[PDB]
């Protein structure tokens, strides 16, 4: 229940992303597993987002940074202006066709490990902008770890996606060093949130009427 990705920027593959993915089994012993868990804990509790925004979704993400939401509580407020110091790229906005090589370049300039959250309907699929100048989803060329529906997602939806990314990071397998060992990145194939929440969602019967505050 793991997908292994191996990157190959100079291989015989031109289409982005320059990577290959294969469904494998969990590679994980009594000490390497514990130290991998410690590295995953440290990485998931210190996620520095890239100060990068395309449209209105960025306004909601930085709203989550402020005092009324305080995403600092999760340890994810540091907000680096440099791609080298950033761990998380939030595609917060429309992937405009003119902006797509820029997004690819900025993703290339980030360093390992890196995660991608596609925030909002535009970044997810193109959203309402099925139009000549808009790429229909940033996952046409960027591998995406978490998708947030919404236009915009509210700041707590961005926080919920941050927690989802934390659970995905906490059970991933990455090279502990670049000198010795397997260097491919193993990501757990999680149960979908739709299937997880289906039981409590279908059981809803009555909601408040839209007539009061």
């Amino acid at each position: 229940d793991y997908t292994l990705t191996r990157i190959d920027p100079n291989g015989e593959n031109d289409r982005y992303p320059l990577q290959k993915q294969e469904i494998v089994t969990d590679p994980l012993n009594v000490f390497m597993g514990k130290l991998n868990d410690m590295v995953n804990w440290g990485r998931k509790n210190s996620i520095w987002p890239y100060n990068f925004g395309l449209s209105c979704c960025y306004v909601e993400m930085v709203t989550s940074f402020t005092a009324v939401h305080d995403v600092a509580r999760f340890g994810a407020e540091v907000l680096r202006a440099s791609p080298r110091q950033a761990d998380l790229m939030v595609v917060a906005g429309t992937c405009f066709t003119k902006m797509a090589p820029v997004i690819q370049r900025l993703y290339d300039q980030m360093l390992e490990p890196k995660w991608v959250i596609s925030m909002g309907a535009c970044a997810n699929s193109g959203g309402m902008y099925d139009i000549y100048s808009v790429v229909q989803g940033v996952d046409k060329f960027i591998p995406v770890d978490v998708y947030i529906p919404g236009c915009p997602p509210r700041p707590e939806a961005y926080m919920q996606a941050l927690m989802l990314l934390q659970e995905s990071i906490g059970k991933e397998r990455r090279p502990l060093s670049w000198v010795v060992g397997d260097q491919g990145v193993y990501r757990a194939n999680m149960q979908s949130e739709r299937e997880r929440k289906r039981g409590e969602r279908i059981a809803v019967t009555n909601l408040r009427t839209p007539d009061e505050i």
Partner: protein, 131 residues
């Protein structure tokens, strides 16, 4: 004595352990974790688009005159550093000497300010046009 040589050894061990701790953290950062590979990874960051030229250029600073003046004024500062540790021994005569020295220093500073030697702001950034 003994406290002096103890403090000398303490200073030596302080410097050695500080430099060794810095080197150890650099080595641990270098060897731990994976590495990223990308086509444009080894391109300098300029907000996502290629550079025009590079950072290796004749970039003209505007405060170079102030840099010369800073070197001069730092030497004047060391003269005052020598005076300030022995003010009671030099007496009022040393005070008169340092007053003349400081007055010549301040007259040179006033001269530099008044001739515009310390001004390098462009004319559109001098903030003359206000309500």
């Amino acid at each position: 004595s003994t406290e002096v040589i103890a403090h000398h050894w303490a200073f030596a061990i302080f410097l050695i352990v500080a430099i060794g701790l810095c080197c150890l953290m650099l080595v641990g950062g270098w060897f731990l974790g994976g590495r990223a590979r990308a086509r444009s990874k080894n391109v300098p960051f300029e907000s996502g688009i290629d550079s025009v030229g590079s950072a290796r250029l004749r970039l003209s600073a505007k405060f170079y005159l102030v840099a010369m003046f800073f070197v001069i004024f730092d030497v004047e500062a060391l003269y005052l550093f020598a005076w300030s540790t022995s003010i009671r021994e030099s007496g009022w005569v040393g005070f008169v000497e340092a007053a003349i020295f400081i007055f010549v220093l301040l007259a040179g500073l006033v001269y530099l300010v008044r001739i515009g030697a310390l001004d390098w702001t462009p004319a559109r950034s001098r903030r003359e046009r206000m309500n």
